Design a protein around this nucleic acid. Structure first.
Length: 454
RNA sequence: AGCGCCGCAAUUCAUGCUGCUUGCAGCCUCUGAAUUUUGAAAUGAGGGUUAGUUUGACUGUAUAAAUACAGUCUUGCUUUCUGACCCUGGUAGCUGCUCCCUGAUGCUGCUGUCAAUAGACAGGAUAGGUGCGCUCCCAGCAAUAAGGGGCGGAUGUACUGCAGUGGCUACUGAAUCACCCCCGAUCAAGGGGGAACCCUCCAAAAGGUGGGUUGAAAGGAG
């Protein structure tokens, strides 16, 4: 469930970029547009409106005659299935957002639609004579691409090259599914300026990798899980296609037994009894309570001011920017909230790792709006005792001065960082009319009680 | 006057210390939370300017672990703050809305000089405020059928008045720099020299050789 996106820039000759632009803009983009129009006019679209799913079999069965079409004749079938995967993902996202919010539905832009790659054997690496990390995809392999990236992204490509060399050196005796690659995305970045379009817009690649494949212990865990799943499926099954499938599965099981030359790092196994709870508020948007959960003595209290080491002014800056943006919208973004959420996630994960924590609880996003409203109400009578005009005025002022804190982004960041480290994530009921530190402590004890009962 | 925010005193607490009784007694030396104060420490600023520095990876030793140290490679992807730079615009076109009063609401307000009133000339954002911003007030103005008061042309109840407003395109160009310059490149490859600090060696010393510092961070895409 955990994936990491690695970004890189692709540099090649002018003729190479010209060929790619002539191959995508004039072929793939009209492909995407025409299948979007076809599914819009497809008679089963109305039936598919009810259920938020779309199998790829029907899309392939409606798309394969375009392979031999004169306008779209020259293109690898891998790019065609990339296009159908892209349209499937886009339509699934459209169904998801329509169901969440519960025609033509076509928009346009300047950069060409991307290129996907689910399999990993097609994308092949090589070492340049200069020393760069060249990549050549399966199909049009005579055209070379140079990869450029930062210091914290080059070692993943080094591991990709090492995996390729190990695969080709051992006569393909190693497992292909054990590679760190998950997905590959080929996009552009809207290069500004004037001139030739192919020489103006940069080309970039995103590689989806798995956290549990970088270290050795993760690679033993994942191969043990895969072997257990394969054996369980075989015993469940214990028909030429199914037969060939079972020999392929046993062949992959044999391939798994071979070990990769990967670095060894000790695995983190947090204690089950130790708990960490995080409470999301407004006056104190994030509070942390590290509790033993066995005896009612709390190991650690942490307010948000201590979490951001020499970064507390960033919260005030983001609040001011949010207020200004709300005022601007009321008349008719720097994306700092994402950075603050990621900083908070890193700080909380570091705090949990310091205290040997293994379980952390977060409030649920859906039912915490009433929690925010009750916190506003509680601080309203906190400021003014009993005259309802005072509480109403204070609530209006406090709402206009400070707005929401983008809780869902924080939830996603915490989940991603915990999955990167290996800390269990739980949910619980946030209590009402209590101190935020006491709120976090009560949430942690409630989470421990729920885990004990369930 | 009131709202949020940064921190100064004092009280309490510990999420800190003193001892081990490993949860209890005391305290604020460091670090944080709650409470009255006030305008003495901090937050705070319009638009951009990089192949930007750092937060990297692997191999071992101390450490149960975090963490520190020694050896090798290195890269330019996307961002958050901070430091420095010019400026509040020019060339040509397109487009929305329009009498007085009372309004919710919105715009403006930096310094010195020529015209009291239109506009320019230079510096420069320490842009009108209690320490700073804010749908909040300080004056002017603007617009909307939010209402009232209408008048002329118009047979007409419809329409127009009683010269302004904001937005979009191609060039221009100011940064194209993280100590600062020069050289061709910004689909690509760096080199040379210079001023300041620290360590070691030569060196009575001056000075030179070898190394490091010339800011810190975050990243799963959609």
């Amino acid at each position: 469930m955990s994936q990491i996106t690695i970004q890189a820039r692709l540099i090649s000759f002018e003729s190479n970029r010209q060929q790619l632009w002539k191959l995508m803009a004039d072929l793939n983009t009209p492909l995407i547009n025409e299948l979007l129009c076809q599914l819009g006019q497809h008679p089963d679209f109305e039936k598919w409106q009810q259920k938020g799913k779309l199998p790829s079999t029907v899309v392939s069965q409606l798309c394969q005659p375009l392979k031999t079409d004169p306008r779209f004749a020259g293109q690898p079938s891998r790019l065609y299935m990339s296009a159908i995967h892209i349209v499937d993902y886009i339509y699934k996202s459209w169904l998801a957002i329509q169901k969440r919010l519960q025609i033509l539905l076509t928009r346009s832009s300047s950069l060409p639609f991307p290129l996907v790659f689910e399999t990993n054997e097609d994308m092949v690496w090589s070492k340049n004579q200069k020393g760069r990390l060249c990549v050549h995809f399966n199909g049009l392999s005579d055209l070379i691409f140079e990869v450029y990236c930062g210091n914290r992204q080059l070692h993943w490509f080094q591991r990709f090259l090492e995996d390729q060399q190990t695969k080709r050196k051992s006569k393909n005796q190693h497992s292909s599914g054990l590679f760190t690659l998950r997905n590959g995305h080929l996009v552009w970045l809207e290069g500004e300026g004037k001139g030739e379009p192919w020489n103006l817009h940069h080309l970039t690649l995103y590689c989806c990798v798995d956290n549990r494949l970088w270290t050795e212990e993760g690679t033993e865990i994942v191969r043990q899980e895969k072997a257990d799943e394969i054996t369980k499926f075989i015993t469940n099954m214990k028909s030429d296609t199914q037969q060939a499938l079972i020999q392929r599965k046993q062949s992959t099981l044999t391939r798994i037994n071979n070990s990769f030359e990967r670095p060894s790092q000790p695995l983190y196994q947090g204690q089950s009894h130790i708990l960490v709870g995080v409470s999301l508020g407004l006056e104190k948007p994030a509070t942390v309570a590290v509790v033993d959960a066995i005896a009612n003595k709390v190991l650690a209290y942490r307010s948000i001011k201590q979490l951001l080491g020499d970064n507390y002014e960033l919260l005030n800056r983001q609040r001011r920017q949010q207020q200004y943006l709300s005022h601007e919208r009321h008349k008719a973004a720097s994306e700092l909230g994402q950075h603050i959420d990621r900083l908070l996630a890193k700080a909380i994960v570091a705090l949990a790792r310091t205290y040997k924590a293994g379980s952390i609880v977060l409030p649920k996003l859906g039912d915490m709006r009433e929690v925010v409203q009750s916190e506003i109400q509680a601080i309203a009578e906190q400021k003014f005792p009993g005259y309802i005009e005072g509480q109403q005025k204070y609530a209006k002022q406090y709402r206009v001065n400070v707005h929401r804190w983008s809780y869902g982004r924080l939830i996603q960041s915490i989940q991603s960082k915990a999955a990167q480290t290996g800390i269990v994530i739980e949910e619980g009921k946030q209590p009402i009319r209590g101190s935020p530190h006491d709120k976090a402590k009560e949430l942690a004890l409630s989470a421990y009680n729920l885990r004990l009962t369930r």
